Amino acid sequence: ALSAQQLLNASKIDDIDSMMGFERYVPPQYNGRFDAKDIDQIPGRVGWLTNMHATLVSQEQGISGVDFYFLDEEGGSFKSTVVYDPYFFIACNDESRVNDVEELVKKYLESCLKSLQIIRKEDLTMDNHLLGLQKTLIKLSFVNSNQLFEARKLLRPILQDNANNNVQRNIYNVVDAKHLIEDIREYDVPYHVRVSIDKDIRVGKWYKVTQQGFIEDTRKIAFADPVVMAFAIATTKPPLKFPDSAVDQIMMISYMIDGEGFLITNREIISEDIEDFEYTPKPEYPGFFTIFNENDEVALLQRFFEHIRDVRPTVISTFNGDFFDWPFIHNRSKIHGLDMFDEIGFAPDAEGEYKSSYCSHMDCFRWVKRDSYLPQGSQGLKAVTQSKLGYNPIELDPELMTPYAFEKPQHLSEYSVSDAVATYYLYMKYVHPFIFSLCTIIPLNPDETLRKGTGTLCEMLLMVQAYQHNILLPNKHTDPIERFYDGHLLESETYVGGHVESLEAGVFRSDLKNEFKIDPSAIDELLQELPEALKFSVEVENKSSVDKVTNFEEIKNQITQKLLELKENNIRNELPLIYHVDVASMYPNIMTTNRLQPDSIKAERDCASCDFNRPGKTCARKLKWAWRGEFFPSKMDEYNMIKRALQNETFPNKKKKVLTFDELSYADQVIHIKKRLTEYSRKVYHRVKVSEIVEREAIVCQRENPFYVDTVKSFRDRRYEFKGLAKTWKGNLSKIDPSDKHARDEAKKMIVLYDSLQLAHKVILNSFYGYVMRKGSRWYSMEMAGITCLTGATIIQMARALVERVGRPLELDTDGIWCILPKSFPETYFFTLENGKKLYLSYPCSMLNYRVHQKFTNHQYQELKDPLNYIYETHSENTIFFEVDGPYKAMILPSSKEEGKGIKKRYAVFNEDGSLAELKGFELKRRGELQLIKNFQSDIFKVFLEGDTLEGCYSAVASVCNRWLDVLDSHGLMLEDEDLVSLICENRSMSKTLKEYEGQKSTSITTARRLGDFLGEDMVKDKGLQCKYIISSKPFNAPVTERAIPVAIFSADIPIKRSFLRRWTLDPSLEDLDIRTIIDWGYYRERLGSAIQKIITIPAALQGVSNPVPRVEHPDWLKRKIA
DNA sequence: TAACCGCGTTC
DNA sequence: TCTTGAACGCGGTTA
Ligand SMILES: Nc1ncnc2c1ncn2[C@H]1C[C@H](O)[C@@H](COP(=O)(O)OP(=O)(O)OP(=O)(O)O)O1
Ligand code: SF4
Ligand SMILES: [Ca+2]
């Protein structure tokens, strides 16, 4: 059926590609040098691989192959095709009677099967695969993917009919071919992934296409220079609505092509003609913009396509172009009966993203959200441009853009152009290098590299490794539709994750004194530990053995000259040293060190049957993780007893209009069971969820095939590279190479380059840890993720134990800790080496490191020495190191309003430089929140730097508080009408459409309903709507939820504006629309109030300063405490 | 009061 | 058909 339907595309695609100068090259025939040793003496064409897609090709049904797109050495492009049979495996019950399994499949699959061979693969779930026993399978090959699916169609029944009971007939009778089929395997490998992997081909790599196949020209250093072009469209829009593809037209289309810039004008909307101008925001981002003022909306769409057809771009960049730009251009093209596909080769795909054959479509927004490391309230185009490229792009109000078409066009023109310059340069300096480089190791084309989840990226990488060690791939994981425990149905099970702690709140500055009580037995402990830990510091930390220089004494003396003077005066009070320490790449290093991988986790049945179960098991490492389950207090009895009704069908047809318990699929059934089961639990239990913890043990086999571990290490290594250059470049020519009088921002450009790159790998890296819990994961282990976490806790806790005994740790999260230490503590030294240069030694860091190494070091790490003879060599492995952040000027931690309880994961930090070092958690950073608190927070944090003493510090702070108070107490009469509105608004996102919030109450929720009635049905068409709202004063004595009002009315017609304000306050006699009359200042007075107590006041108190802002008082407990 | 829920952060 | 994790904060309701 489909092979013709699917070869339509193939032929269509082939024509389009050819249109763009992608003619299907075929190489000369050669018999001789087949080895890649003499690559020149082999005929063919050298090309840089830019792209690859799955295709069907007729004889030269249809046969599955892969189109590969190249740029030649000469300039201009070409294409080539590898054909390669889709394939998968049948597993077998008893590995004896396999010819019999090959016999019946050969017969049963005559319709679709092409080829059949028995093969062997390693399989890490087989008893002694470590001793060379390989698992046997039948390899099923097809001429195409479609044929392969047909096979999976014909196998599923027997896979299911064999999973169910064989039902006898002669019940007195004192096997069949089919019943030996164990399972099916590697059947869902995306086809192009299959080729890319099997043939070892990767985009970004240089190949010569030859008769024999592809040869990586491993000699060509750097990538080619694809023609990139990045666009942005400007759109007409109603007041207070979103652009619509039916009613609305496209004002402008701005774009760039390798630094040459362009703008296309709809003259029917843009009144004035527009003149060639320039927008060069910084000097490194040149944008000359010649313009094409075009008569019709059509001539605009057609001047667009024509240019793209001319320049022939293999990359087309956009900012969120997938969900706005492209679908707008497409629908407005459908209007005029233009065919975008026929015109530029782009169409939707089965996920609604716009992709083309020849040209990758690189939606920078996907990078931004996945890989930028920016918070959600910075994933905006503006803020990205700010953060990433270091400048402010032209701003323009949305509701203005449609007006500014007529009135002020040159203004809007310059903005449209800015959207593009920010996109093109964002792409080139950040996206292009990352993705294209990443494709050289990941078997995906650039579009999927950019888009796939980071969990998937990990999977791909793990597949190449597993393939290349001939390891059979486990099937995707499947979750039980319900689990139980101690009789109780399970709600959710996980493991105890990270260990977080707030210890002390308040301001801590370098110029303000602090009181310390140094544990005496700790500095005794560390006095003993100084020799090894400093030999350590040189033997590993710099790995430079010992006595590289002489100072090993001129330093081991100087350290004690502070450690001794400390132990006697073990209660001092002076200036602080504010330090963060944080284990670099914790979970990955914890994993590599403990040789942690899903397959490395064995049971009783597993570890026993192993032929290394001899005397002196040095290969079974015992590690503890903490399981946690959430269940109903209903035991076996009640649980079982809630079998209950099973008789309320109540569901739909397509004449059906009737069902039963057992007529609803087990999903729907279990959904209903959810409801009923909740009732009996709370009714008899006095709770609706019990959560208990049990320490589990797990056996981490040290001998297992480390394809997973090794992959993690490889990716960590990949990353440390950039964390090397990042640290290098921080002092390389930023610290000591310039005099600050030589404007070399060049090093400042590199640091953002490498800081971004190193971060961009962070999430993929840690996704090697997360992955083992991902759904539809091929290598699932709760145990492993469990063990990794708890080990992390243990490591950080133990490190706190020491620090609290030797200073005051402020805050602590997972792998990192903040602490002030005494200002006369052994800081950082430079053990000097004879060979000229000097190393770096920070005693606090190296102090912890030795203890890590002397307490959590894998002494069981076995690795395979002699393949043929199965000889493992044990050795000692530990890659866990703390890293210091240098000493900071200040640090502010909020305190809770609840009593004793602190606030974790929020704080502000400042450099001796004076600049804001780090800011965490706060509403200022987060998307939405109350714009008041945000600007307050903006204003406030800096001001913790003013003031001469701790007491006097909170003063300059307290001023700002009162300032901001005098704006609320003054019922915002101190603030301009236009200005105020913004400052008072609170912006929230709904992540789902409004329909899917059935029976919940929230400001976002009702704002949505309100927008809905006011501006219309379309207003909640789709998910992700921003709810901009103020909370009204009336009705008095009514829940907050109810008084959420969209700020849109406050720019809408007065009749409508009244009818709704009156409606929304149950106040029909409402006549006053005064924006300030409706605003419930009393509420907004508490919120700003909470902020003050959180940041300023309760922290003030806990540091024994009298409340500095009495216009908001202590809670009854903070009062009832001072007594 | 305590248990929740949704967002959106920190790890 | 896509699909890393768990610990927190906070405003808000729910029982
Ligand atoms: N994005 C994440 N996904 C899954 N786990 C994460 C993620 N981020 C952090 N973690 C967990 C695993 C990390 O090892 C642990 C420590 O936090 P953090 O220090 O930010 O990561 P890291 O230690 O791996 O980075 P760095 O090496 O830069 O310190 O937090
Ligand atoms: S832990 Fe030791 S005995 Fe158990 S499977 Fe691994 S190598 Fe064999
Ligand atoms: Ca870390």
Coordinates of C-alpha atoms in Angstrom, one line a residue, chain A residues 94-386:
Chain A
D94 CA 15.6 -23.0 24.8
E95 CA 18.7 -22.0 22.8
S96 CA 18.8 -25.6 21.5
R97 CA 15.9 -26.0 19.1
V98 CA 16.7 -22.9 17.0
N99 CA 16.7 -24.4 13.5
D100 CA 13.1 -25.2 14.4
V101 CA 12.5 -21.5 15.1
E102 CA 14.2 -20.5 11.9
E103 CA 12.1 -23.1 10.2
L104 CA 8.7 -21.8 11.1
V105 CA 9.6 -18.1 10.8
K106 CA 11.0 -18.7 7.3
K107 CA 7.5 -20.2 6.6
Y108 CA 5.4 -17.8 8.6
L109 CA 7.1 -14.7 7.2
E110 CA 7.1 -15.5 3.5
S111 CA 5.1 -12.3 2.7
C112 CA 7.6 -9.7 4.0
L113 CA 10.9 -11.4 5.0
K114 CA 13.9 -11.0 2.6
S115 CA 16.8 -12.6 4.6
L116 CA 17.4 -14.7 7.7
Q117 CA 20.7 -15.6 9.4
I118 CA 21.5 -16.8 13.0
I119 CA 23.9 -14.5 14.8
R120 CA 25.4 -14.2 18.3
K121 CA 25.6 -11.1 20.5
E122 CA 26.8 -10.4 24.1
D123 CA 24.0 -9.9 26.6
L124 CA 24.7 -8.5 30.0
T125 CA 21.6 -10.2 31.5
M126 CA 23.0 -13.7 30.8
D127 CA 24.4 -15.8 33.6
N128 CA 28.1 -16.0 32.6
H129 CA 28.4 -13.7 29.6
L130 CA 31.6 -12.6 31.3
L131 CA 33.1 -16.0 30.5
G132 CA 32.3 -15.6 26.8
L133 CA 28.8 -17.3 26.5
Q134 CA 27.1 -15.4 23.7
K135 CA 23.3 -15.4 23.2
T136 CA 21.9 -16.8 19.9
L137 CA 19.3 -15.0 17.8
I138 CA 17.8 -15.0 14.4
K139 CA 18.4 -11.9 12.4
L140 CA 15.4 -10.8 10.3
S141 CA 16.2 -8.5 7.3
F142 CA 13.8 -6.7 5.1
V143 CA 14.1 -4.6 1.9
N144 CA 12.4 -1.7 3.7
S145 CA 11.1 -0.3 7.0
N146 CA 7.5 -0.9 5.9
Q147 CA 8.2 -4.6 5.2
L148 CA 9.8 -4.8 8.7
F149 CA 6.7 -3.3 10.3
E150 CA 4.5 -5.9 8.6
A151 CA 6.7 -8.5 10.2
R152 CA 6.2 -6.9 13.6
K153 CA 2.5 -7.0 12.9
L154 CA 2.7 -10.8 12.3
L155 CA 4.8 -11.5 15.3
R156 CA 2.9 -9.6 18.0
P157 CA 0.0 -12.1 18.1
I158 CA 2.2 -15.1 18.7
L159 CA 4.3 -13.1 21.1
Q160 CA 1.0 -12.5 23.0
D161 CA -0.6 -16.0 22.4
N162 CA 2.6 -17.4 23.8
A163 CA 2.6 -15.1 26.8
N164 CA -0.9 -16.4 27.6
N165 CA -2.0 -19.9 28.6
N166 CA -1.8 -22.9 26.2
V167 CA -5.3 -24.4 26.8
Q168 CA -5.4 -28.2 26.6
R169 CA -8.2 -30.3 25.2
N170 CA -7.6 -33.9 26.0
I171 CA -7.5 -33.1 29.7
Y172 CA -6.1 -36.6 30.4
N173 CA -3.0 -36.4 28.2
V174 CA -0.1 -37.7 30.4
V175 CA 6.7 -28.2 22.2
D176 CA 5.1 -26.5 19.2
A177 CA 7.3 -24.4 17.0
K178 CA 6.0 -21.0 17.9
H179 CA 6.0 -21.4 21.7
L180 CA 9.8 -21.1 21.6
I181 CA 9.8 -17.5 20.6
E182 CA 11.1 -15.8 23.8
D183 CA 10.8 -12.2 22.5
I184 CA 11.7 -9.7 19.8
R185 CA 14.7 -7.4 20.0
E186 CA 16.1 -4.1 18.6
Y187 CA 12.9 -3.6 16.5
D188 CA 12.2 0.0 17.4
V189 CA 15.6 1.5 16.5
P190 CA 14.8 4.5 14.3
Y191 CA 16.0 3.4 10.9
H192 CA 18.4 6.2 10.1
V193 CA 19.9 5.7 13.6
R194 CA 20.5 2.1 12.5
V195 CA 22.4 3.1 9.4
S196 CA 24.3 6.0 11.0
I197 CA 25.4 3.7 13.8
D198 CA 26.1 0.5 11.8
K199 CA 28.1 2.4 9.1
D200 CA 29.7 4.7 11.7
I201 CA 28.7 7.9 9.7
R202 CA 28.2 11.2 11.4
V203 CA 27.3 14.7 10.3
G204 CA 30.0 17.3 10.7
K205 CA 32.7 14.7 9.6
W206 CA 34.5 14.8 6.3
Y207 CA 33.8 11.8 4.0
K208 CA 34.8 10.6 0.6
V209 CA 31.9 8.8 -1.1
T210 CA 33.4 5.8 -3.0
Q211 CA 32.0 2.6 -4.6
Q212 CA 32.9 0.6 -1.4
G213 CA 31.2 3.2 0.8
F214 CA 32.3 6.2 2.8
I215 CA 35.8 6.9 4.1
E216 CA 36.3 9.4 6.9
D217 CA 38.9 11.8 5.6
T218 CA 40.4 12.0 9.1
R219 CA 42.9 14.7 7.8
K220 CA 40.5 17.7 7.3
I221 CA 40.7 19.7 10.5
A222 CA 37.7 22.0 10.7
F223 CA 34.1 22.2 9.5
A224 CA 32.9 23.7 6.2
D225 CA 31.0 26.9 5.9
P226 CA 27.3 26.1 5.1
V227 CA 25.3 29.1 3.9
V228 CA 23.2 30.0 7.0
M229 CA 20.2 32.3 6.8
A230 CA 18.1 33.3 9.8
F231 CA 14.7 35.1 9.6
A232 CA 12.0 36.8 11.7
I233 CA 8.5 37.9 10.6
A234 CA 6.5 40.8 11.8
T235 CA 2.7 40.5 12.0
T236 CA -0.4 42.7 12.2
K237 CA -2.4 42.0 15.4
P238 CA -5.8 43.1 16.9
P239 CA -5.6 45.1 20.2
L240 CA -5.3 42.7 23.1
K241 CA -5.2 39.6 21.0
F242 CA -2.7 37.2 19.4
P243 CA -1.9 37.2 15.6
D244 CA -4.3 35.0 13.6
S245 CA -3.4 33.3 10.3
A246 CA -6.8 33.9 8.8
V247 CA -7.5 37.5 9.7
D248 CA -4.0 38.9 10.1
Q249 CA -1.3 39.6 7.4
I250 CA 2.5 39.7 7.7
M251 CA 4.0 43.2 8.0
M252 CA 7.7 42.5 7.6
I253 CA 10.2 39.7 7.2
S254 CA 13.8 40.4 8.4
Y255 CA 16.7 38.0 7.8
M256 CA 20.5 37.6 7.5
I257 CA 22.7 35.5 5.2
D258 CA 26.3 35.1 6.3
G259 CA 26.4 38.6 7.7
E260 CA 24.5 40.3 4.8
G261 CA 21.1 41.5 6.1
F262 CA 17.7 41.9 4.6
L263 CA 14.1 43.2 5.2
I264 CA 11.0 42.6 3.1
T265 CA 8.2 45.1 3.4
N266 CA 4.4 44.7 2.9
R267 CA 3.8 48.1 1.4
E268 CA 0.0 47.6 1.9
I269 CA 0.7 47.8 5.6
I270 CA 4.0 49.7 6.0
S271 CA 3.0 53.2 4.7
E272 CA 6.4 54.8 4.2
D273 CA 9.0 53.2 1.9
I274 CA 12.1 52.1 3.8
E275 CA 15.8 53.0 3.0
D276 CA 18.9 50.8 3.2
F277 CA 20.2 51.3 6.8
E278 CA 22.5 49.7 9.3
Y279 CA 22.1 48.1 12.7
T280 CA 25.4 47.2 14.4
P281 CA 24.5 46.7 18.1
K282 CA 28.1 45.9 19.0
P283 CA 31.1 46.0 16.5
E284 CA 31.4 42.2 16.4
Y285 CA 27.8 41.9 15.1
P286 CA 27.8 43.8 11.7
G287 CA 24.3 44.2 10.1
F288 CA 24.0 46.1 6.9
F289 CA 20.4 45.8 5.8
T290 CA 19.4 46.4 2.1
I291 CA 15.6 46.5 1.8
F292 CA 13.0 45.1 -0.5
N293 CA 9.8 47.2 -0.3
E294 CA 7.3 44.9 -2.0
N295 CA 3.8 45.8 -3.1
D296 CA 1.5 42.9 -2.0
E297 CA 1.5 40.5 0.9
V298 CA 2.0 38.0 -1.9
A299 CA 5.0 39.7 -3.5
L300 CA 6.4 39.6 0.1
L301 CA 5.9 35.8 0.4
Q302 CA 7.3 35.4 -3.2
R303 CA 10.3 37.7 -2.7
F304 CA 11.0 35.5 0.4
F305 CA 10.9 32.1 -1.3
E306 CA 12.7 33.3 -4.4
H307 CA 15.7 34.5 -2.4
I308 CA 15.9 31.3 -0.4
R309 CA 15.9 29.5 -3.7
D310 CA 18.8 31.7 -5.0
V311 CA 21.2 31.6 -2.0
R312 CA 20.5 27.9 -1.3
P313 CA 20.8 27.7 2.5
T314 CA 21.7 24.4 4.2
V315 CA 20.8 26.0 7.5
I316 CA 17.7 28.2 8.2
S317 CA 17.6 29.7 11.7
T318 CA 14.6 31.1 13.6
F319 CA 13.7 32.0 17.1
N320 CA 10.7 29.9 18.0
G321 CA 10.1 29.7 14.3
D322 CA 8.7 26.2 14.7
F323 CA 5.5 27.3 16.4
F324 CA 4.9 30.8 15.2
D325 CA 7.0 32.1 12.2
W326 CA 6.8 29.0 9.9
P327 CA 3.1 28.1 10.5
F328 CA 2.2 31.8 9.9
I329 CA 4.1 32.0 6.7
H330 CA 2.6 28.6 5.6
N331 CA -1.1 29.5 6.3
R332 CA -0.7 32.9 4.6
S333 CA 0.7 30.9 1.7
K334 CA -2.2 28.5 1.7
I335 CA -4.5 31.5 1.5
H336 CA -3.0 32.7 -1.8
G337 CA -2.8 29.1 -3.1
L338 CA 1.0 29.1 -3.0
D339 CA 2.6 25.7 -2.2
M340 CA 5.4 26.4 0.3
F341 CA 6.7 22.8 -0.1
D342 CA 6.9 23.2 -3.9
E343 CA 8.3 26.7 -3.5
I344 CA 11.1 26.2 -0.8
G345 CA 10.8 22.5 0.1
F346 CA 9.6 23.0 3.7
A347 CA 6.5 21.2 5.2
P348 CA 5.3 20.2 8.7
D349 CA 6.2 16.8 10.0
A350 CA 4.3 14.4 12.3
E351 CA 5.0 16.7 15.2
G352 CA 4.1 20.0 13.6
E353 CA 7.6 21.3 13.3
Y354 CA 8.8 22.7 10.0
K355 CA 11.6 20.7 8.4
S356 CA 13.0 20.5 4.9
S357 CA 15.1 17.9 3.1
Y358 CA 18.3 19.8 2.0
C359 CA 18.2 22.5 4.8
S360 CA 18.3 22.0 8.5
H361 CA 15.9 24.3 10.4
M362 CA 17.6 25.4 13.6
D363 CA 15.1 26.9 16.0
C364 CA 17.5 28.7 18.4
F365 CA 14.6 28.6 21.0
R366 CA 15.1 24.8 21.3
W367 CA 18.8 25.3 22.2
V368 CA 17.8 28.2 24.6
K369 CA 15.4 26.0 26.6
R370 CA 17.5 22.8 26.5
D371 CA 21.2 23.9 26.5
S372 CA 21.6 27.6 27.4
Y373 CA 21.4 26.9 31.1
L374 CA 19.2 30.0 31.4
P375 CA 16.1 30.1 33.8
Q376 CA 12.7 30.2 32.2
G377 CA 12.3 33.9 32.8
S378 CA 15.4 34.5 30.6
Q379 CA 14.5 32.2 27.8
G380 CA 12.9 35.2 26.2
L381 CA 14.5 36.5 23.0
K382 CA 15.4 39.9 24.6
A383 CA 17.0 38.4 27.7
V384 CA 18.8 35.8 25.8
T385 CA 20.3 38.5 23.5
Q386 CA 21.2 40.3 26.8

